[PDB]
Curated annotation (Swiss-Prot):
Family according to the record: Belongs to the metallothionein superfamily. Type 15 family.
Protein name, as recorded: EC protein I/II
Function: Binds 5 molecules of zinc. May have a role in Zn(2+) homeostasis during embryogenesis.
Regulation: induction: By abscisic acid (ABA).
Superkingdom assignment: Eukaryota
GO molecular-function terms, A-Z: zinc ion binding
Organism from which the protein derives: Triticum aestivum (Wheat)
Full protein: residues contained: 2 to 25 of 81
Chain coiled-coil ranges: none
Keyword vocabulary terms for this entry: Metal-binding, Metal-thiolate cluster, Zinc
Signal peptide start-end: none
């Protein structure tokens, strides 16, 4: 499902999902 990690390069307790820059990279 969803649930970020610090390994991503952004905070773990995310603001939600899609709006975050979590997927603006490739
Ligand atoms: Cd995030
Ligand atoms: Cd993330």
């Amino acid at each position: 499902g969803s649930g970020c990690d610090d390994k991503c390069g952004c905070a773990v307790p995310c603001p939600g999902g899609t709006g975050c820059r979590c997927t603006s990279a490739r």
